[PDB]
Amino acid sequence: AALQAILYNRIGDIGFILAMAWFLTNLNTWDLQQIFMLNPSDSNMPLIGLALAAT
Amino acid sequence: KFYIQEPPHGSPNWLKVGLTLGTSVFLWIYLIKQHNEDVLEYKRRN
Amino acid sequence: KYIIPTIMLMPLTWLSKNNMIWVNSTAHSLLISFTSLLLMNQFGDNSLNFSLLFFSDSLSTPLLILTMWLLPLMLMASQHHLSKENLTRKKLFITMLISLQLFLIMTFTAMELILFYILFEATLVPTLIIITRWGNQTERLNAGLYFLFYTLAGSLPLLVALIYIQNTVGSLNFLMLQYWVQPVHNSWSNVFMWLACMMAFMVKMPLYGLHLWLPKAHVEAPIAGSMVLAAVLLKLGGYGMLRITLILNPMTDFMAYPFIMLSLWGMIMTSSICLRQTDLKSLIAYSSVSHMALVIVAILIQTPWSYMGATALMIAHGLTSSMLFCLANSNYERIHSRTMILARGLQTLLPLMATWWLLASLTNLALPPTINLIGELFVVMSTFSWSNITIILMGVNMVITALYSLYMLIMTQRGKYTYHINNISPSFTRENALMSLHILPLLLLTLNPKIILGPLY
Amino acid sequence: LLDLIWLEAILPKTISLAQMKASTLVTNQKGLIKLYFLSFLITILISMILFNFH
Amino acid sequence: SMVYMNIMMAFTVSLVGLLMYRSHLMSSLLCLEGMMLSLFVMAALTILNSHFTLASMMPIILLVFAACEAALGLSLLVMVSNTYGTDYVQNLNLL
Amino acid sequence: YDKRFLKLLRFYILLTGIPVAIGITLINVXXXXXXXXXXXXXXXXXXXXXXXXXXXXXXXXX
Amino acid sequence: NPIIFIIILLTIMLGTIIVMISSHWLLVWIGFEMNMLAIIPIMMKNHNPRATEASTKYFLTQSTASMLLMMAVIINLMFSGQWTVMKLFNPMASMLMTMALAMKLGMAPFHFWVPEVTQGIPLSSGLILLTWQKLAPMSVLYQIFPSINLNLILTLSVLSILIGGWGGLNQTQLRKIMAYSSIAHMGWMTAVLPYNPTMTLLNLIIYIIMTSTMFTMFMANSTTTTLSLSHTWNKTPIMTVLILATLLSMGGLPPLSGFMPKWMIIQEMTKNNSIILPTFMAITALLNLYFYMRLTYSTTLTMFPSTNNMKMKWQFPLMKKMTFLPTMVVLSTMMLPLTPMLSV
Amino acid sequence: XXXXXXXXXXXXXXXXXXXXXXXXXXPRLAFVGFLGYCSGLIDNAIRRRPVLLAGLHRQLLYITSFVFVGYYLLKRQDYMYAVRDHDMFSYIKSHXXXXXXXXXXXXXXXXXXX
Amino acid sequence: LLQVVRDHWVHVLVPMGFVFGYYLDRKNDEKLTAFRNKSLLYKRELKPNEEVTW
Amino acid sequence: XXXXXXXXXXXXXXXXXXXXXXXXXXXXXXXXXXXXXXXXXXXXXXXXXXXXXXXXXXXXXXXXXXXXXXXXXXXXXXXXXXXXXXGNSYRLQAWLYASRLLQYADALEHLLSTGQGVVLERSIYSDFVFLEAMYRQGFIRKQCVDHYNQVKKVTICEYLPPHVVVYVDVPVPEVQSRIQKKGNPHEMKITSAYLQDIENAYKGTFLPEMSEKCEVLQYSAWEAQDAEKVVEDIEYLKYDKGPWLDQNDRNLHKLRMLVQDKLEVLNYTSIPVFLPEVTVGAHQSDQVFQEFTELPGRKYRAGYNEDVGDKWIW
Amino acid sequence: XXXXXXXXXXXXXXXXXXXXXQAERLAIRSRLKREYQLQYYDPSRRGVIEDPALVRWTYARSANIYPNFRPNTKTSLLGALFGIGPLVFWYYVFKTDRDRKEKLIQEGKLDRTFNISY
Amino acid sequence: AKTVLRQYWDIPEGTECHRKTYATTSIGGAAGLVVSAYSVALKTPTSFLEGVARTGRYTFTAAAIGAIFGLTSCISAQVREKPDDPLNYLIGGCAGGLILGARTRSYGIGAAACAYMGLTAALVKMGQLEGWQVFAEP
Amino acid sequence: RWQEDPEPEDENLYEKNPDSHGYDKDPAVDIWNMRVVFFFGFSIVLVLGSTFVAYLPDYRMQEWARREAERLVKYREAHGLPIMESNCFDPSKIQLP
């Protein structure tokens, strides 16, 4: 019961760390203060990332 | 135990021990005197 | 500064009286380990040479500090073992650790490749004596012979490789002198020259192919569980891949391409087996494959970001897997079997050791920034700049890194042990003191990880 | 399949085949000065006819 | 040149004779003195044709050593028959 | 066996926790840091570069 | 046995001196024959059915070999004329020359006599003679290193380590293991002769010291692996550590003196630009390590060789250089890199 | 060089070229002296005698003999390396055409990506 | 005085080995005295002390 | 270094009244033991009979080693009530054969250096009589005897002379009543067939000993206890065609070196063969080697020893 | 694996063969329990019991490898296609990504100006 | 003979391969005759009836290795483009070691060492470039 | 047959004839080792050693580069047009081809 709570969360981690790595490679700032300015239109970041972390 | 049935070595040979400690002195003086001669030879040539 | 006081530990154990021995070996090692964090840390923009090339300075190697940290730590758990046997047998196998530490200090410090080679293979000889003797279970020889005929089979091609470089391009020596090194023209004659330089650090740094050297050495226990940590020191002891790839062949990365993929599959398949395995020591033996495989991937990318995580992982793994083996040893001297299912019960029988079991297992996972998160995260970020497809495979590995350590927890967090009656005393002072001396350095590296992750940082 | 058999299968290619080649050079020739000197007849013929050097 | 080719051909037959063993061990000790006989004729012709005078002493020394090995091997033949019955190349124990 | 270990651990943390308490007062009593352009005379004296804490200069000498 | 045994032993020493100090080709031939007359009496000594087989086998597979050497000497009269130990001049002369020396050093197609001869010696002191006799024909090859066809010397180097590395694997006899360890080390000797003649003399110095220590460690009677197994658990326990140190050095390992051969042989070979040959030398060198590895398990493991009989009395052996030589055989690595120049 | 050309054959010492100055209490001499002391430790293990370090005082013979032979061995080392350098530097000056100098150049080289 | 020296003998050698190690490894800079003051990186003219710093 | 090159030479200062005498095969009862003490009227040297603690009786220590310090499980009282499986049986005899060989090596060394007559109680050549008598009854397995014959062929052939004069005492089959009269209770109640088999084997042991032209004189139970009769027989019996007469320079020099060192002779006695009655276990061997090292007698061994002698350190 | 109907009590008969079958199974079950019972209820023990079942269970995976795999036939060869095969599968996946990436750097830029790290 | 070996290196320069197949059998046959000569040291029972039987099994199989190796070298050369390559002779090395498992009924061993024999055959064919030498002089 | 090979003894300190200890045998040696010098290295290397690590002696120009960068920003902005890097460490190179 405690194992599954992390197990399904770690499948959710697949997107999250992919959202971490995309953020650095595209933007040198890495912090959350960047994306409000010079925002690029990309579907790769939130879909395979934040939406995958939302599962 | 007090060494039963006679030991092969009594422990101080003196005849053999004296020569082994004697030869070490002979070797020490022979090398330093050649070492002092080498320093004089090196200074004379260069 | 480091060699000579380490050599003076050799007459210390032999001259001291029969009742003491262990007190002198542990106390004097701790004061020498203090001076490593006192003098070695000083560096400029480019780290300046120490003295003459007998032992040199550290540029990107604070991994020496880890060897100095395990310098007394290996002597702690080896107290319960060896105690039944003769005093001369004790004095020999304490000095074999000192001889190991003597050669291990020489490997990381000396900025060389020619003299480094005759210290890399020189560490294999003391470990061979330690692994083959004092084995609790049988098949000692099916691990002892395996220890040389894997490493020496891959490392002897360095003699034909390293000498070939210095005969054409000046001399290897300082590495700080090595600006003479010209980029490789990529020829079929130069193909096996690159492979010979790699294969030595493809065995000690375990891949998926030729990886069988590692788990055989860990399962068949050398002495108790603290001599297993010396085999962990040899995984990180193969750090020459940080030096060869950076200097000797910087243009060569086309031949690295299949060897990244060979280590990439040594992540999913190495984690799959480590789920149904019965031996508790084997579960740490296969987890040690994956963590060191992450370093292998990072080195061959050659990006400045990957080295920051690679050097961090060398220190991260060396204090966490060694911590895990001490927990395996703490059950091995009470139950007298490496079986996971038989030895089952924490908190109900082992109250305070269970919290140490938690912190060691949680470090295999990505905890709040200690060193393991810091070490792994740079590699994942570096792989995406290398190729975007990686995290689809690397993310699956992150799922089974939970299963690497939670399966260790679940099969110990059960109120049973009906067949068992032993293990009355949970920890006799030093048993928990071992666990604290492994985790508290990682907790101190939370505040300052700049000292750990430093290849031009 | 992989972790215990096929990745280990590289070793008998250098151990079991090596021991097979070893047995053909130890147990061969049941003593006899005759047999070792019969082979020495061929060794000269290899250097003279089968090899171009003189 | 011409005469040398015949005595070199006699050397090759005696060379095979030392490498061929059948039943008795006595054939080898004949061929040991046989091979030394062929070398002695070869030495005699080479030194005398292109005169040396000083180096004509050398084959006389060689002829002394020609039977030095032959006398020792023939004495070893004696002790084998005492341990066994008859000297045989076919009869050996060591591996 | 469990509770004694925590007490024996804390006894040696507090034993070397005294120079930690003195370590705070060293910032208080002695001067911490000053940034100023130096005149051309000497580049290094006792410590070559001292910043933030005065304890950095004391370790730089030995 | 009392007086003349010292004289017989001295004539091998004197016999090698004739080979060492020489200018004439017939003079070294005498020196080789001086060994023939002087080893065989010590080969027998006790007079055994095993000793009679080995002594005749040592005679016939060496005296006939020297007779091939005399042919090459006579071709030096046929061609080039002069009786001088410098060059063979003829390629036809060198072929019969090298194969004659291969019966003593090359080993690759002439190893057959070695295992039967080494086991046939009843004495432990007689085992030193075979490892010391190899000094004599090496001094000959050190003089005639040019003119000789490298295609048929390097085959006597590559193949010799192959048969040396395989031939000891299926042998339990302690004398037989050391017989093929000789062939394994002699393979390296024939490889340095084309590529820089210096260090080849030092290769012997490392080899002779390492082997002379080995047999003197077996002064306590041992003929098999199982007989040497009962050494630490019944007899002297600290003696096995020095046996462990010598065996770990016999196979090429860096923290010992037995890596100093492997150091310069590959180093000088690579200077002449050769990659494919010294790679094969290193992999086959692993096969040499296996014999000593199994023989270190008589010093490390339990193995249960206790037996009913237990020794209490102190052992009093001869031990000529069993104290000075093992120290140079164990810890000669730091005082080693400059030593190649000191030998020649 | 393997064969002698300037020096006379068969000699224990150099004699012809003596001016070089031998080492005085060298770091290399201390290791050979340690090896002489190491031989005086292991001989008491073979012949079973009480104490490895505090045993018999016949160890002084083992220390002296290794130093004495080692000093002459180190003298041969420094001589032979000097002759090697002497012959090498003389070969360049005698030929001149064999050696060529090239310094200060700016040339393009291919840079690796990633 | 006699009881203290007999009890501790091996214990004194390890910190004494550190002083001997520190002194011997420091003396290596005397062999590497060349380029003590060269170019502009860490070079200054002497005022009172000889050769700036060792 | 060899000392035979100098003034010291073999066969010198001996020969006249120097031959060794032995009392062998005394069935079971110690009748030869009493007459050996009276045999010291003609011969100078006399040695005690070999037992479980006979090698430990001399060697280096003054006092005999107790049980665990010497051979593990070796007692004559335990072998009196011999039991199969996990017992003595053969491991007593293998230790007994080596002990008789060791004291013979000291006796031959005493004979060569300064010529004196040595009388030995029960030789090595009489050991197989004691073995085969126990073999007739269900005590020792056939495979153990094959191990013994391998030791028999190696140890004997190394030594050139067996014995010059051999004394054989043959008593009546009612010797068991004479053995029961003795004060020892552990030696009593022995098997009647075992004592009879030793007497039967002694007839096939004295006959091959006499066939090798070695002098042997038989003494009866009625002729026993006489001191003047036994002493006169030793001087009367002349050696003819015997193996004792050998080369003084070549043969005697090799035998003197092999008998001088105890380690040289005992090395062949230890065979590399696995046996059920041999005690192979290394775990028990390590604890036995630790106890021998902790013993106040030997400890460091050979001359110099701490807290027992200590004469010179320099 | 599961069928159309889950097995729990389905398809069971009394008969005579099944009656003796339960007698066989309970006989061994009681035999292996009694040897545990004599070893469990005594204060003089103190120590973890071995049991031949669990030792052979660990030995089944760690050992018994080279005595096995002597009839390979085809089933072992199919495992190698699933073994080294996936490495060849990913070899063309990453290679197509390299041809995509390397072309974009030289002509028609795809890499962002904000990028600087690695 | 080295003169036979020198003829082998002149053929792959062109497109002709009918002479190349006969050239490989002469090297492969002579290599078998050496192994056939050392098998006499094993001592054959009787005379000629079993003596020539052991010579037949070794020489015919060793010549067959060369015969297929000679054919497969030009099957990969004529079909598809590209001249001499290490990959081109690797296919040729595979078929040569395949018939060792056809010699003895075991389906593997030789076929198990298909990659082992193929890589070693490719390593000799790496020596056509100037960056490889077997025996050196200067 | 094992004869002497069958020898095994279960040994555990626990509390019996030890009171409370870690090292086997001798109560006087145990307290002076396992509680004193075992914890002396725990107090010096961990607590007094924490002051070092990276904090204090600058460590590979981490703090120095901050003050060095700030003074170069304000100077180059006031005079030059290009900020920091544009064509750095290369001026008038000897051609390309």
Tab-separated table of N, CA, C and O in Angstrom, chain C residues 285-332:
chain	number	residue	atom	x	y	z
C	285	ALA	N	24.885	-5.752	-4.726
C	285	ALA	CA	25.854	-6.047	-5.789
C	285	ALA	C	25.380	-5.652	-7.187
C	285	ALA	O	26.193	-5.256	-8.024
C	286	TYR	N	24.077	-5.772	-7.433
C	286	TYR	CA	23.487	-5.391	-8.719
C	286	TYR	C	23.019	-3.935	-8.767
C	286	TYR	O	22.910	-3.355	-9.852
C	287	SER	N	22.755	-3.354	-7.595
C	287	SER	CA	22.450	-1.923	-7.471
C	287	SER	C	23.697	-1.068	-7.696
C	287	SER	O	23.601	0.075	-8.156
C	288	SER	N	24.856	-1.636	-7.366
C	288	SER	CA	26.155	-1.002	-7.584
C	288	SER	C	26.569	-0.961	-9.059
C	288	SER	O	27.424	-0.157	-9.441
C	289	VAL	N	25.960	-1.824	-9.874
C	289	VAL	CA	26.181	-1.848	-11.325
C	289	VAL	C	25.545	-0.613	-11.977
C	289	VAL	O	26.201	0.078	-12.760
C	290	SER	N	24.286	-0.341	-11.627
C	290	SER	CA	23.493	0.744	-12.222
C	290	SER	C	24.002	2.149	-11.893
C	290	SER	O	24.041	3.014	-12.773
C	291	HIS	N	24.380	2.363	-10.631
C	291	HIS	CA	24.899	3.652	-10.160
C	291	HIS	C	26.229	4.038	-10.812
C	291	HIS	O	26.463	5.217	-11.095
C	292	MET	N	27.084	3.043	-11.044
C	292	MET	CA	28.371	3.251	-11.716
C	292	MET	C	28.233	3.305	-13.239
C	292	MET	O	29.092	3.873	-13.919
C	293	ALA	N	27.153	2.714	-13.760
C	293	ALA	CA	26.809	2.787	-15.187
C	293	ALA	C	26.399	4.200	-15.603
C	293	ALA	O	26.645	4.609	-16.739
C	294	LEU	N	25.777	4.926	-14.671
C	294	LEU	CA	25.416	6.338	-14.842
C	294	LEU	C	26.638	7.229	-15.064
C	294	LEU	O	26.568	8.208	-15.814
C	295	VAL	N	27.745	6.880	-14.406
C	295	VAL	CA	29.033	7.563	-14.571
C	295	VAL	C	29.605	7.270	-15.963
C	295	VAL	O	30.081	8.185	-16.639
C	296	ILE	N	29.529	6.002	-16.380
C	296	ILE	CA	30.010	5.531	-17.692
C	296	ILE	C	29.335	6.276	-18.851
C	296	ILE	O	30.015	6.711	-19.788
C	297	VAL	N	28.011	6.428	-18.768
C	297	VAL	CA	27.228	7.200	-19.743
C	297	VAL	C	27.705	8.660	-19.772
C	297	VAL	O	27.982	9.197	-20.846
C	298	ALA	N	27.836	9.261	-18.587
C	298	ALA	CA	28.236	10.665	-18.421
C	298	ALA	C	29.609	11.009	-19.012
C	298	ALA	O	29.754	12.042	-19.669
C	299	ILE	N	30.596	10.139	-18.783
C	299	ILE	CA	31.975	10.341	-19.259
C	299	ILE	C	32.060	10.377	-20.791
C	299	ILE	O	32.718	11.255	-21.358
C	300	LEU	N	31.368	9.445	-21.444
C	300	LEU	CA	31.425	9.291	-22.902
C	300	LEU	C	30.679	10.377	-23.694
C	300	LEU	O	30.899	10.520	-24.902
C	301	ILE	N	29.809	11.133	-23.019
C	301	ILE	CA	29.145	12.305	-23.617
C	301	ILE	C	30.148	13.464	-23.764
C	301	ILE	O	30.129	14.183	-24.770
C	302	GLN	N	31.015	13.618	-22.758
C	302	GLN	CA	32.107	14.621	-22.714
C	302	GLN	C	31.676	16.094	-22.563
C	302	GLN	O	32.499	17.006	-22.719
C	303	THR	N	30.399	16.316	-22.248
C	303	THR	CA	29.876	17.655	-21.942
C	303	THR	C	30.345	18.107	-20.551
C	303	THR	O	30.449	17.272	-19.647
C	304	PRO	N	30.624	19.425	-20.370
C	304	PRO	CA	31.105	19.942	-19.072
C	304	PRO	C	30.132	19.748	-17.902
C	304	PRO	O	30.560	19.759	-16.745
C	305	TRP	N	28.848	19.574	-18.215
C	305	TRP	CA	27.798	19.339	-17.222
C	305	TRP	C	27.778	17.919	-16.662
C	305	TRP	O	27.451	17.722	-15.487
C	306	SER	N	28.120	16.944	-17.505
C	306	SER	CA	28.100	15.525	-17.136
C	306	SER	C	29.160	15.155	-16.100
C	306	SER	O	28.890	14.355	-15.201
C	307	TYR	N	30.351	15.747	-16.234
C	307	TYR	CA	31.469	15.541	-15.302
C	307	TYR	C	31.163	16.027	-13.886
C	307	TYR	O	31.641	15.440	-12.911
C	308	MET	N	30.368	17.096	-13.792
C	308	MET	CA	29.905	17.665	-12.517
C	308	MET	C	29.063	16.666	-11.722
C	308	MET	O	29.134	16.629	-10.490
C	309	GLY	N	28.270	15.869	-12.439
C	309	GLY	CA	27.466	14.799	-11.851
C	309	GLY	C	28.207	13.483	-11.720
C	309	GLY	O	27.936	12.708	-10.798
C	310	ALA	N	29.135	13.235	-12.646
C	310	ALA	CA	29.953	12.019	-12.655
C	310	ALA	C	30.887	11.945	-11.449
C	310	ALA	O	30.930	10.919	-10.770
C	311	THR	N	31.611	13.038	-11.186
C	311	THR	CA	32.513	13.151	-10.026
C	311	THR	C	31.758	13.124	-8.696
C	311	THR	O	32.276	12.618	-7.696
C	312	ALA	N	30.542	13.673	-8.702
C	312	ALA	CA	29.654	13.665	-7.539
C	312	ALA	C	29.123	12.264	-7.231
C	312	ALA	O	29.013	11.893	-6.062
C	313	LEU	N	28.808	11.500	-8.281
C	313	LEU	CA	28.326	10.116	-8.156
C	313	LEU	C	29.367	9.143	-7.607
C	313	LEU	O	29.006	8.167	-6.946
C	314	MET	N	30.643	9.412	-7.890
C	314	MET	CA	31.769	8.619	-7.375
C	314	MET	C	31.847	8.691	-5.848
C	314	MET	O	32.151	7.692	-5.188
C	315	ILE	N	31.567	9.877	-5.306
C	315	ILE	CA	31.536	10.119	-3.859
C	315	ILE	C	30.185	9.693	-3.264
C	315	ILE	O	30.138	9.149	-2.155
C	316	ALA	N	29.104	9.932	-4.012
C	316	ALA	CA	27.744	9.559	-3.600
C	316	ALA	C	27.586	8.053	-3.397
C	316	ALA	O	27.071	7.619	-2.366
C	317	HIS	N	28.049	7.273	-4.373
C	317	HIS	CA	27.945	5.813	-4.345
C	317	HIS	C	28.874	5.165	-3.317
C	317	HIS	O	28.503	4.173	-2.685
C	318	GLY	N	30.066	5.738	-3.151
C	318	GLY	CA	31.093	5.212	-2.246
C	318	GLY	C	30.776	5.257	-0.760
C	318	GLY	O	31.397	4.535	0.027
C	319	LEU	N	29.819	6.104	-0.379
C	319	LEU	CA	29.393	6.241	1.017
C	319	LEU	C	27.967	5.739	1.290
C	319	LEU	O	27.541	5.684	2.449
C	320	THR	N	27.245	5.368	0.231
C	320	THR	CA	25.864	4.875	0.349
C	320	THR	C	25.745	3.362	0.175
C	320	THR	O	25.011	2.711	0.922
C	321	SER	N	26.452	2.815	-0.816
C	321	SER	CA	26.491	1.367	-1.046
C	321	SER	C	27.309	0.657	0.030
C	321	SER	O	26.973	-0.460	0.433
C	322	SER	N	28.376	1.318	0.484
C	322	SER	CA	29.194	0.854	1.610
C	322	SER	C	28.407	0.871	2.923
C	322	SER	O	28.609	0.014	3.786
C	323	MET	N	27.517	1.855	3.055
C	323	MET	CA	26.556	1.935	4.156
C	323	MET	C	25.563	0.763	4.113
C	323	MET	O	25.222	0.198	5.157
C	324	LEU	N	25.127	0.402	2.903
C	324	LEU	CA	24.211	-0.724	2.682
C	324	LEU	C	24.838	-2.088	2.983
C	324	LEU	O	24.152	-2.982	3.489
C	325	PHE	N	26.126	-2.239	2.668
C	325	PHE	CA	26.871	-3.471	2.960
C	325	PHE	C	27.113	-3.685	4.454
C	325	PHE	O	27.180	-4.830	4.913
C	326	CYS	N	27.244	-2.585	5.198
C	326	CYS	CA	27.365	-2.616	6.659
C	326	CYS	C	26.076	-3.085	7.337
C	326	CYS	O	26.125	-3.744	8.379
C	327	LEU	N	24.936	-2.737	6.736
C	327	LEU	CA	23.621	-3.215	7.177
C	327	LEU	C	23.429	-4.701	6.876
C	327	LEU	O	22.776	-5.413	7.644
C	328	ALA	N	23.989	-5.150	5.751
C	328	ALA	CA	24.005	-6.565	5.377
C	328	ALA	C	24.916	-7.370	6.302
C	328	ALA	O	24.615	-8.520	6.625
C	329	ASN	N	26.020	-6.747	6.720
C	329	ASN	CA	26.976	-7.338	7.659
C	329	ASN	C	26.408	-7.436	9.076
C	329	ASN	O	26.690	-8.402	9.792
C	330	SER	N	25.606	-6.442	9.466
C	330	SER	CA	24.970	-6.394	10.790
C	330	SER	C	23.915	-7.490	11.001
C	330	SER	O	23.552	-7.796	12.139
C	331	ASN	N	23.430	-8.059	9.897
C	331	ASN	CA	22.532	-9.214	9.918
C	331	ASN	C	23.284	-10.526	9.667
C	331	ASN	O	22.821	-11.597	10.070
C	332	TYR	N	24.439	-10.428	9.006
C	332	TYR	CA	25.267	-11.588	8.663
C	332	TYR	C	25.973	-12.203	9.871
C	332	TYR	O	26.220	-13.411	9.894
